[PDB]
Scaffold this active site. Structure first.
Site, PDB file in Angstrom:
ATOM      1  N   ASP A  25       0.811  -1.213   0.000  1.00  0.00           N
ATOM      2  CA  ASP A  25       0.000   0.000   0.000  1.00  0.00           C
ATOM      3  C   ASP A  25       0.842   1.260   0.000  1.00  0.00           C
ATOM      4  O   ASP A  25       1.363   1.658   1.036  1.00  0.00           O
ATOM      5  CB  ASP A  25      -0.917  -0.030   1.237  1.00  0.00           C
ATOM      6  CG  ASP A  25      -1.975   1.043   1.205  1.00  0.00           C
ATOM      7  OD1 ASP A  25      -1.737   2.122   0.629  1.00  0.00           O
ATOM      8  OD2 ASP A  25      -3.083   0.808   1.732  1.00  0.00           O
ATOM      9  N   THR A  26       1.004   1.934  -1.143  1.00  0.00           N
ATOM     10  CA  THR A  26       1.913   3.074  -1.155  1.00  0.00           C
ATOM     11  C   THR A  26       1.276   4.322  -0.545  1.00  0.00           C
ATOM     12  O   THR A  26       1.944   5.336  -0.297  1.00  0.00           O
ATOM     13  CB  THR A  26       2.367   3.397  -2.585  1.00  0.00           C
ATOM     14  OG1 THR A  26       1.207   3.575  -3.406  1.00  0.00           O
ATOM     15  CG2 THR A  26       3.181   2.257  -3.180  1.00  0.00           C
ATOM     16  N   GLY A  27      -0.026   4.209  -0.294  1.00  0.00           N
ATOM     17  CA  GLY A  27      -0.788   5.276   0.364  1.00  0.00           C
ATOM     18  C   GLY A  27      -0.629   5.245   1.869  1.00  0.00           C
ATOM     19  O   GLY A  27      -0.786   6.257   2.556  1.00  0.00           O
TER      20      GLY A  27
HETATM   21  N1  LIG Z   1     -12.070   1.633  -2.464  1.00  0.00           N
HETATM   22  C1  LIG Z   1     -11.332   2.392  -1.623  1.00  0.00           C
HETATM   23  C2  LIG Z   1     -11.264   2.016  -0.244  1.00  0.00           C
HETATM   24  C3  LIG Z   1     -10.477   2.790   0.657  1.00  0.00           C
HETATM   25  C4  LIG Z   1      -9.791   3.979   0.238  1.00  0.00           C
HETATM   26  S1  LIG Z   1      -8.894   4.855   1.466  1.00  0.00           S
HETATM   27  O1  LIG Z   1      -9.259   4.297   2.784  1.00  0.00           O
HETATM   28  O2  LIG Z   1      -9.153   6.302   1.276  1.00  0.00           O
HETATM   29  N2  LIG Z   1      -7.228   4.663   1.267  1.00  0.00           N
HETATM   30  C5  LIG Z   1      -6.476   5.832   0.744  1.00  0.00           C
HETATM   31  C6  LIG Z   1      -5.891   6.671   1.895  1.00  0.00           C
HETATM   32  C7  LIG Z   1      -6.687   6.994   3.033  1.00  0.00           C
HETATM   33  C8  LIG Z   1      -6.116   7.770   4.085  1.00  0.00           C
HETATM   34  C9  LIG Z   1      -4.765   8.216   4.011  1.00  0.00           C
HETATM   35  C10 LIG Z   1      -3.970   7.920   2.861  1.00  0.00           C
HETATM   36  C11 LIG Z   1      -4.537   7.129   1.829  1.00  0.00           C
HETATM   37  C12 LIG Z   1      -6.627   3.347   1.664  1.00  0.00           C
HETATM   38  C13 LIG Z   1      -5.556   2.903   0.640  1.00  0.00           C
HETATM   39  N3  LIG Z   1      -4.240   3.375   1.137  1.00  0.00           N
HETATM   40  C14 LIG Z   1      -4.354   3.718   2.577  1.00  0.00           C
HETATM   41  C15 LIG Z   1      -5.833   3.543   3.022  1.00  0.00           C
HETATM   42  N4  LIG Z   1      -6.062   2.422   4.001  1.00  0.00           N
HETATM   43  C16 LIG Z   1      -5.869   0.969   3.735  1.00  0.00           C
HETATM   44  C17 LIG Z   1      -6.980   0.220   3.010  1.00  0.00           C
HETATM   45  C18 LIG Z   1      -8.336   0.540   3.248  1.00  0.00           C
HETATM   46  C19 LIG Z   1      -9.332  -0.177   2.531  1.00  0.00           C
HETATM   47  C20 LIG Z   1      -8.986  -1.234   1.637  1.00  0.00           C
HETATM   48  C21 LIG Z   1      -7.621  -1.556   1.398  1.00  0.00           C
HETATM   49  C22 LIG Z   1      -6.630  -0.790   2.062  1.00  0.00           C
HETATM   50  S2  LIG Z   1      -6.542   2.881   5.608  1.00  0.00           S
HETATM   51  O3  LIG Z   1      -7.039   1.689   6.270  1.00  0.00           O
HETATM   52  O4  LIG Z   1      -7.150   4.195   5.613  1.00  0.00           O
HETATM   53  C23 LIG Z   1      -4.887   3.077   6.250  1.00  0.00           C
HETATM   54  C24 LIG Z   1      -4.358   4.388   6.368  1.00  0.00           C
HETATM   55  C25 LIG Z   1      -3.066   4.607   6.909  1.00  0.00           C
HETATM   56  C26 LIG Z   1      -2.240   3.509   7.236  1.00  0.00           C
HETATM   57  N5  LIG Z   1      -1.001   3.716   7.732  1.00  0.00           N
HETATM   58  C27 LIG Z   1      -2.757   2.203   7.125  1.00  0.00           C
HETATM   59  C28 LIG Z   1      -4.078   1.987   6.646  1.00  0.00           C
HETATM   60  C29 LIG Z   1      -9.881   4.346  -1.134  1.00  0.00           C
HETATM   61  C30 LIG Z   1     -10.643   3.577  -2.062  1.00  0.00           C
END
Ligand SMILES: Nc1ccc(S(=O)(=O)N(Cc2ccccc2)[C@H]2CNC[C@@H]2N(Cc2ccccc2)S(=O)(=O)c2ccc(N)cc2)cc1
Ligand SMILES: [Cl-]
Ligand SMILES: [Cl-]
Ligand SMILES: [Cl-]
Lengths: 99, 99
Positions: A25-27
């Site tokens: 997860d690069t986010g």
């Molecule tokens: N379909 C879909 C589902 C979820 C999202 S998301 O939650 O916004 N999102 C983007 C993001 C949110 C907050 C900060 C930075 C990035 C996900 C993806 N990268 C991080 C984030 N997450 C992981 C995730 C969530 C749902 C499904 C698969 C993975 S999270 O749980 O917010 C997270 C945030 C920070 C860390 N350390 C770990 C986890 C986007 C599209």
């Protein structure tokens, strides 16, 4: 490897002698795993997701193998939707984004 | 480009005639942007992660430019704390994970 993104980039990891599936997860700034037992003391940490901040447990200097690549670093534990390998360990294994 | 993960992989995008900063996020199945107006029909969706879920509007067949690369796809719009470029659009620009 070179991993395309048509599907979730799910890989096998090993931690505490156990194999697990986790998402690259690069986010995610930080690695976060589902509830599990880790050695040592933990410290409090807040991580922010799409719906707000939550409290998780921070364990430092934890040995973890990712797709066969060795890392030792911080592992957070809490109610993550899936096991996530975040930038702190992706950097350690030399992972980059390319296009 | 080859993008390092020492820091957040933030890039400039152009959408709806607007320049915005967004995160290249391999953990995100979908692209999700802060509130804005987009053309055409939409339908509601809920997306979630640590912290919980939010309600967003789903727009299909939207044109976006990402680091100079043009792509077409679904964009979700709602109260996200960060603009996210997800896999649905990362695939179209040829983006891969490499280590
Ligand atoms: N379909 C879909 C589902 C979820 C999202 S998301 O939650 O916004 N999102 C983007 C993001 C949110 C907050 C900060 C930075 C990035 C996900 C993806 N990268 C991080 C984030 N997450 C992981 C995730 C969530 C749902 C499904 C698969 C993975 S999270 O749980 O917010 C997270 C945030 C920070 C860390 N350390 C770990 C986890 C986007 C599209
Ligand atoms: Cl670390
Ligand atoms: Cl799409
Ligand atoms: Cl491809």
């Amino acid at each position: 490897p070179q991993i395309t993104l048509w599907q979730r980039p799910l890989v096998t990891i090993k931690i505490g002698g156990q194999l697990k599936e986790a998402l690259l997860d690069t986010g995610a700034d930080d690695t976060v795993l589902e509830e599990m037992s880790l050695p040592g003391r933990w410290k409090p940490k807040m991580i922010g997701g799409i719906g707000g901040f939550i409290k998780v447990r921070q364990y430092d200097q934890i040995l973890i193998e990712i797709c066969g690549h060795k890392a030792i670093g911080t592992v957070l534990v809490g109610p993550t939707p899936v096991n996530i390998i975040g930038r702190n360990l992706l950097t350690q294994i030399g992972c980059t984004l390319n296009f």
